[PDB]
């Protein structure tokens, strides 16, 4: 059995932004936990439906890595039971979620001076999202019964904005990278190990 | 689907795009201040136009949503706000012709020099030289002869400019459902959608009056000290039962009554706390400055200052390094970045201004929680009511004893404290009735009650009637006296600081109050009460989302100003005033 070699999830050239949340399929290798807090410099680090460690050498079904970037004050945002922004049309984890949730602060490499406008985050979506849902959509919202006809205006704003992260922002407003680890259980065989 | 629906949408666009703007548009700014380069310039005017852009579309974009149909205040107030485009409504030929207007007086403000009435090479600007002048000279026929010039070549030129100004202003008004420009600006102060919190405009008017009345007996006896000193300096031209001249005041314009104090100066002798000496021999620091104020805003309660305040403020002259403007400034960029500009020196006066610009910090830093629309302070006063309060409870002897700053068995005598509470006096007592007064005076002119032809008649009129003033030599309508003040020309608003005043000693009373302090209010200090800091937060997080009467109410127990508090704070003045005035006139012959 070879190490999940995390290192391509965690450390990356570049994240994706939250209406993108990349998700990377862990089976056919090992991958311990304890490392992991091993690793440290994680200002969250928190598993869902799981024991601390209980799972350090365990077995479990198909693990999805989901990466994306995200503001601070967001960061509550990725944890069953919230309803903000980023939950309810961008990411949205499950009431019954058995996984882990990471981050750390990313403000010394996807912050640049002059604002690194690349992540986006979808402001208004007509439904809420559904667990682990997607939705890289790029239709103007449709706010009133006049239609849009693709083009900005009154009651038809544009549903994808951008992130405005620079080194001078305060924490709340400063990149932060995120890494949910889903840990689906079940009687189903496993390959992930540890 | 409904209308407030389809706000909610609206609004939160324009917040998270606004927020961004803003941020980019303060950041420019803060270059072009912390740096000053033709090229930040141009930047900063480039972020400028299109923060200004945005809030003119979103402004009428947001007139089509109707008010009326909208039902949650919050959604409601933001709304309002956005929707006051102002100079929109006016044809853009007069919005020109406004913006022209105020570009030409501002200009003559600011390129306007006196020269001389003798010698030719003595021609100084108005601020460099003629300000000194008027402040530390004590000559009458000197000083006549600044006052005149400002309000001679300086106003007689601003007279017709102002005289157009009222009638395109009030057209702005008229044409944004406001009875004058003055009701716009009194307006400032209106809320609604409460039981009685609820604020009309006109109320500011007869609150403002009501409370100058409980105010006039302090300024009164104030009026006869002063006056009896300067008689005593100037015996050849006062009145011992009259108003007193103008170029006497101690500032071009007399708004301010605190370079009289070695003139005015009870006893004399007795010195004034200046712990400038002591922190220079203490060998403190810019830096150390402004941790002292944090760890006193940290004891009170309230958190500390971002690592990004202290990473990025700019507290220290930059060397040589760069050019920079130096007036003290509290900066909310927006997006958490919160920064202080400050060329600080190691003096007592800019250790009490750190704290009150951090007081302003803190205060930003309490309503970010709140929508952008909703993030500023409760009315147009509470900002700089709460960095006063901060000032006021760092310049008692406690704190600077306990920050090490004071011998530790330091004792006040009563000559000490009366002196420092004559200086406060002046700058703050001093300034009340000659607030009110302009500000009265604009407002009825706005409303047209004063005609041009007796324009600068009243003017002097009033000041006899309330500030006790006097024009040293007769101004005909020619002049205009009026404009001759930077926020007249610049039309600013003025009753901020009368406001200010009023609220920040209801506020430390209350504060006070809440640290079990006792005995005279000019000696309090709030440090480590943590009870203070959760009721000051309490109105703070509230930003301008809840009724400013509301905001009060949660810190004061009020829901209106009230004077009581400063006739307490000054109370020991006032009746060390009252004896010294025993033998001579309290009051002022209106005519003379
Ligand atoms: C609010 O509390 C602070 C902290 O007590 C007051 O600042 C002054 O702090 C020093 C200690 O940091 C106090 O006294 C010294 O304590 C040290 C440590 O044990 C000891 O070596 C010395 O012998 C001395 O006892 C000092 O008394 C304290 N000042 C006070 C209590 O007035 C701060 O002054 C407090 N706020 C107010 C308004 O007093
Ligand atoms: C203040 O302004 C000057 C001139 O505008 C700035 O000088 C910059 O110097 C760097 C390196 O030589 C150049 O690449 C830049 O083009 C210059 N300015 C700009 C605006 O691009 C200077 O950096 C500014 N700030 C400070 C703190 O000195
Ligand atoms: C790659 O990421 C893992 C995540 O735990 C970390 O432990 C490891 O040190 C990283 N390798 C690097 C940064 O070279
Ligand atoms: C800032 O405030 C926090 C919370 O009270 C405190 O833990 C911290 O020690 C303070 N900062 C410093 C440098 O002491």
Redesign the interface.
């Given at each position: 059995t070879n190490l999940c070699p995390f290192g391509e999830v965690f450390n990356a050239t570049r994240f994706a932004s939250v209406y993108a949340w990349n998700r990377k399929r862990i089976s056919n290798c090992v991958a311990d936990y304890s490392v992991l807090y091993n690793s440290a410099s994680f200002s969250t680090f928190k598993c869902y439906g799981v024991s601390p460690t209980k799972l350090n050498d365990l077995c479990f079904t198909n693990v999805y890595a989901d990466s994306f970037v995200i503001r601070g004050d967001e960061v509550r945002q990725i944890a069953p039971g919230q309803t903000g922004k980023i939950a309810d049309y961008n990411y949205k984890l499950p009431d019954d979620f058995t996984g882990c949730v990471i981050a750390w602060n990313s403000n010394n490499l996807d912050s640049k001076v002059g604002?690194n406008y690349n992540y986006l985050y979808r402001?208004?979506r007509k439904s809420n999202l559904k667990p682990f849902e997607r939705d890289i959509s790029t239709e103007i919202?449709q706010?009133?019964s006049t239609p849009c006809n693709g083009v900005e205006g009154?009651?038809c704003?544009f549903p994808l904005?951008?992130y405005?992260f620079?080194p001078?922002?305060?924490?709340?407003?400063?990149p932060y990278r995120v890494v949910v680890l889903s840990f689906e259980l079940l009687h189903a065989p496993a390959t992930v190990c540890g | 689907?409904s209308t407030e629906?389809?706000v909610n949408?609206?609004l939160?666009?324009f917040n998270?795009?606004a927020e961004?703007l803003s941020?980019?548009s303060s950041?420019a700014s803060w270059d072009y201040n912390t740096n000053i380069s033709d090229e930040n310039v141009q930047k900063m005017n480039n972020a400028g136009a299109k923060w200004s852009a945005f809030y003119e579309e979103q402004s009428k974009?947001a007139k089509?949503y109707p008010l009326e149909e909208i039902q949650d205040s919050t959604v409601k107030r933001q709304l309002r706000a956005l929707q006051h485009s102002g100079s929109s409504v006016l044809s853009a030929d007069k919005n020109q012709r406004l913006n022209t207007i105020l570009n030409s007086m501002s200009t003559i403000y600011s390129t306007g020099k006196a020269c001389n009435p003798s010698n030719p090479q003595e021609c100084l600007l108005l601020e460099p030289g003629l300000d000194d002048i008027m402040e530390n000279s004590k000559d009458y026929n000197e000083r006549l002869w600044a006052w005149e010039g400002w309000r001679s070549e300086v106003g007689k030129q601003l007279r017709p400019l102002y005289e157009e100004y009222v009638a395109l202003k009030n057209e702005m008004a008229r044409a944004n459902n406001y009875e004058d420009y003055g009701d716009y600006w009194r307006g400032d102060y209106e809320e609604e959608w409460e039981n009685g919190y609820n604020y009309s405009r006109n109320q500011l008017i007869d609150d403002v009056e009501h409370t100058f009345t409980q105010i006039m007996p302090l300024y009164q006896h104030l009026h006869a000290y002063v006056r009896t000193k300067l008689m005593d300096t100037y015996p050849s031209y006062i009145s011992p039962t009259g108003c007193l001249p103008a170029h006497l005041l101690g500032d071009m314009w007399g708004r301010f009554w605190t370079n009289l104090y070695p003139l005015t100066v009870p006893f004399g002798q007795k010195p004034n706390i200046d712990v400038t000496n002591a922190m220079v021999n203490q060998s403190w620091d810019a830096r150390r400055i402004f941790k002292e104020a944090e760890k006193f805003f940290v004891s009170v309660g309230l958190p500390n200052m971002?690592?990004?305040f202290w990473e990025?403020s700019m507290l220290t002259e930059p060397s040589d390094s760069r050019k920079v403007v130096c007036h003290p400034t509290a900066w909310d960029?927006g997006?958490?970045?919160?920064r202080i500009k400050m060329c600080t020196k190691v003096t007592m006066d800019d250790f009490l201004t750190a704290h009150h610009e951090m007081g302003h910090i803190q205060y930003d830093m309490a309503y970010?929680a709140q929508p952008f629309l909703l993030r500023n302070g409760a009315n147009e006063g509470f900002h700089e009511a709460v960095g006063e309060i901060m000032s006021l409870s760092a310049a008692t002897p406690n704190h600077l004893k306990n920050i090490g700053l004071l011998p530790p068995s330091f004792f006040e005598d009563s000559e000490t404290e009366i002196n420092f509470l004559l200086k406060q006096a002046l700058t703050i007592v001093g300034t009340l009735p000659f607030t009110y007064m302009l500000e009265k005076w604009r407002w009825m002119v706005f409303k047209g009650e004063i005609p041009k032809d007796q324009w600068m008649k009243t003017w002097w009129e009033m000041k006899r009637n309330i500030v006790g003033v006097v024009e040293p030599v007769p101004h005909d309508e020619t002049y205009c006296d009026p404009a001759s003040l930077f926020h007249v020309a610049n039309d600013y608003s003025f009753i901020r600081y009368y406001t200010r005043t009023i609220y920040q000693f209801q506020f430390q009373e209350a504060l006070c109050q809440i640290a079990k302090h006792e005995g005279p209010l000019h000696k309090c200090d709030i440090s480590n009460s943590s009870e203070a800091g959760q009721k000051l937060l309490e109105m703070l997080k509230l930003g301008k989302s809840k009724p400013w009467t509301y905001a009060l109410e949660i810190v004061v127990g009020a829901k209106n100003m009230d004077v009581r508090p400063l006739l307490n704070y000054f109370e020991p003045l006032f009746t060390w005033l009252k004896e010294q005035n025993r033998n001579s006139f309290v009051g002022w012959n209106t005519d003379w």
């Open positions: 604002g402001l208004f919202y706010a009133g009154f009651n704003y904005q951008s405005g620079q001078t922002n305060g924490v709340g407003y400063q | 689907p629906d389809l949408t609206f939160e666009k998270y795009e961004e941020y980019q950041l974009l089509t971002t690592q990004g990025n960029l997006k958490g970045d919160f970010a």
